[PDB]
Structures are given as structure tokens and as C-alpha cells.
Amino acid sequence: ASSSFKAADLQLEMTQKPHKKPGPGEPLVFGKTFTDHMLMVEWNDKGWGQPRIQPFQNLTLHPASSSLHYSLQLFEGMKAFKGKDQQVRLFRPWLNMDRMLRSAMRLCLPSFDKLELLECIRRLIEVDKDWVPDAAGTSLYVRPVLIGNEPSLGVSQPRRALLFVILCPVGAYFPGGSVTPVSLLADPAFIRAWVGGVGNYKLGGNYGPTVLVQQEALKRGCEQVLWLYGPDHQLTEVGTMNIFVYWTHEDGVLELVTPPLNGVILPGVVRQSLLDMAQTWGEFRVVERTITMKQLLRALEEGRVREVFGSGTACQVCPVHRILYKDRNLHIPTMENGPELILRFQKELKEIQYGIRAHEWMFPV
């Protein structure tokens, strides 16, 4: 018993003022450059309306829209890569569709068919193929969004909603192969999410309270925030990335560990891919288990820690070299291990994402 919204029904309108691309690899600050078209689907009493694809344009919302009063909003983030030159592929889009639908049900927003949305996104990206860069480490960021849109102040299940997708060409997250480490502020006073909360869904509500904390991290000399949880001070996620630790655990076994999906952390697509990939190799233990600051401190001085990094769509595998804890700067030996594992993960993903290696994880055009 559930909705619809079909891809066979798209309508099409092309831009009369096709904006001009970034040119050489120089500008494009992430998220501030948009392509010529966008996807838009409306839902109401008559259910889902028809998809289509229109020129990039402003939204028109009633002043009481629940999307602005009660944060009835959720989003996704995924990437399209252009490799064999002009051939464009989406990395594991199905997982983002699965996650988006779960976020929708948590916020009582309308359900939709994951494959139809994926096909409309495919159609949209097709129209803006030329916006997809092909220089090393660049890609096209895809931002689907679903918002409640009830022109009513009652806190309740909306009877109207809007789904849209916009695209941004992105530069190489790292200047040029320059994989550079980041420093993290790890302060227990800051709490991103709670057990029983909504940290495991991609809801706008989870992000707004982090702006002030990120500003604090900069003022204290760090680049991102390492979110801690519990009296235990466990490591949950870093910034907008899941966190991984490669070290010789306390029982002498070499392992790659990452916090488990206990409800407080976001099930990252890159996170799942690194786990899958490492399990496949079978060269060392790969496990999902709780990581505490106390365990990290001990391992660091017995020189048991090899590499620590974050994973996410923006920055696939991100080295960490320093963590400021309790006034405490902890040097993380990641780079002196020449991010061997980090480097290996990056290479495999590049080969897969840019079509060098055929793989089911990729979705065509």
C-alpha cells in the first residue's frame, strides 16, 4: 500500500541562458556553483504530480510552510563521475535512495519509488552532462531534497510536499593528489546526536546546530569536529564523515574498526564501501565496534595506531593527523605510515568510480 510518481512522465524545459562553466581547474568553491537545470516533483491531496526538469530557478513557498517552521526537510548527497571521457557514472546511488526513503518515513513525508527517482535523476544529469568535469579528482555533486510544504502552523504530517534535485560541479577535494591530513577538535561538551534520536537519518535538523561548533573548532586551531558521545567519550563521526581507525588492537590483532550503526551515527555510503572492500580482501580483521578516547590514548603510546581517517562523499578517505582532546593535542601517526591503507582505498575507489575497472557499484550515465 504505497504512492507512485513515474519517470515515463517527465516534462522538459531547457535554459535560454545556459550559464557558462568554470573553465580551467581553478574556481568552483564547493556548493556555490549550480548547473542549468533541476528536477521538481510536487505531492498533495492528488498524490504525486509529474516530474519534468526545468531551468534552475527559485522556489516559491507559503510563509507558513512546515519546511521552514518545523524542519520538515531531508536531503541526500551523492556523486557522478565522468571517466572514459564523456561517460558518466553514479556511485552506488541505490544506497542514497534507500537512505532518503528511510529519512522520509521518519519525518512522515511521502514515500516514492526509489528507481523512478533514480531514473529522473539519471535524466537530469544527462541534460547537464557537460557540467560534469573530467579533470582528475573532480565530479558532479547531486543534491536531492524533500520538504514538507503545508501552509499551516500546526506541528503535523504535511498534506503537501516538494521534491527537488539540484547539481553542483565539484573540484578535486584535495588541490592535486595532495591528500593532506586534517586536525580535529574533540570536546565532550558538543553533542551531535543521541540514542533514540535522529542522527542516523539525513535530516537538515542534524546540521544547523553544528555551525557554531565548527566555528569553535576553527577558533581553537582545528579544521573539523570529532563528535564524542557518552561518559565513555566514544568517537562517533568526524564533521560530515564516518570515522575509521586502523591499528593493532589490544589483543595483538591487526584491524580496521569503525563505530557500529547504533542509531547515533549516519550509515555513510563510503563507510559501507570501505567495510565491503576491506572484508573482501581478507587480509585483516574488519569490525564494527565502539571506540573510546581512552582506548585511543593507550594504543597511540604503545605505537599501536597506524592510520585514522574519515570517509564521506565529499572527501572519500580523509587522513587525520591531529586531535585536540581536553587541551590535549594528540599527534596521529597516520601520514608517517604513508596512508598505505588510505592510499590503497583511494586508488581502488578512483579505478571503480572513473570506469577504469568495471564494477556493479557504478550506475551508467
Q: Which residues bind its own copies (CB under 8 A)?
A: 29-32, 34, 38, 56-73, 75, 106-108, 141, 143, 145, 147-148, 151-157, 164, 166, 168, 188-191, 194-198, 203-212, 214-215, 240
From ligand ILP, its own copies, none, interface partner of 82 (C-beta below 5 to 8 A by class):
none
Give the amino acid at 50.
Answer: Q
Segment lying near ligand ILP (by CB under 6 A), choices 125-133, 234-242, 301-309, 343-351? 234-242
* Cβ 362 vs Cβ 90: under 8 Å: yes
Measured from the CB atom, the residue of 48 and 227 that comes closer to ligand ILP is 227
Q: Which of 51, 77, 83, 110 binds ligand ILP (CB under 6 A)?
A: 77
From its own copies, ligand ILP, none, interface partner of 16 (C-beta below 5 to 8 A by class):
none
241 near ligand ILP, rule: CB under 6 A? yes
Measured from the CB atom, the residue of 52 and 313 that comes closer to ligand ILP is 313
From its own copies, ligand ILP, none, interface partner of 330 (C-beta below 5 to 8 A by class):
none
From ligand ILP, its own copies, none, interface partner of 269 (C-beta below 5 to 8 A by class):
ligand ILP
Q: Which of 242, 258, 295, 346 binds ligand ILP (CB under 6 A)?
A: 242
Measured from the CB atom, the residue of 155 and 297 that comes closer to ligand ILP is 155
Report the length, in residues, of the chain. Answer: 365
73 Cβ contact list (under 8 Å, min separation 6): 67, 107, 145, 146, 147, 148, 203, 204, 205
Q: Which of 268, 319, 339, 355 binds ligand ILP (CB under 6 A)?
A: 268
- Which H or E element spans position 118? helix 114-127
* Cβ 330 vs Cβ 345: under 8 Å: no
- What is the DSSP code string of 97-116? HHHHHHHHHHTTPPP--HHH
* Cβ 167 vs Cβ 126: under 8 Å: no
Residue 222 CB-density burial (10 A; 0-12 exposed, 13-18 middle, 19+ buried): buried
From ligand ILP, its own copies, none, interface partner of 271 (C-beta below 5 to 8 A by class):
ligand ILP
141 is in an annotated binding site: yes
- CA dihedral (303, 342, 180, 237) positive or negative: negative
Measured from the CB atom, the residue of 95 and 170 that comes closer to its own copies is 170
208 Cβ contact list (under 8 Å, min separation 6): none
Q: Which of 314, 335, 343, 365 binds ligand ILP (CB under 6 A)?
A: 314
Residue keyed to cell 564547493: 30
312 near ligand ILP, rule: CB under 6 A? yes
Show contacts with ligand ILP in window 141-180 (CB under 6 A): 153, 155
**Cβ atoms within 10 A of the Cβ of 331, count?**
10
358 Cβ contact list (under 8 Å, min separation 6): none
Q: State the nearest-atom distance from the C-beta of 26 to its own copies, in Å.
A: 18
* Cβ 179 vs Cβ 52: under 8 Å: no
Applying CB under 6 A, which residues contact ligand ILP? 77, 153, 155, 237, 240-242, 266, 268-271, 311-314
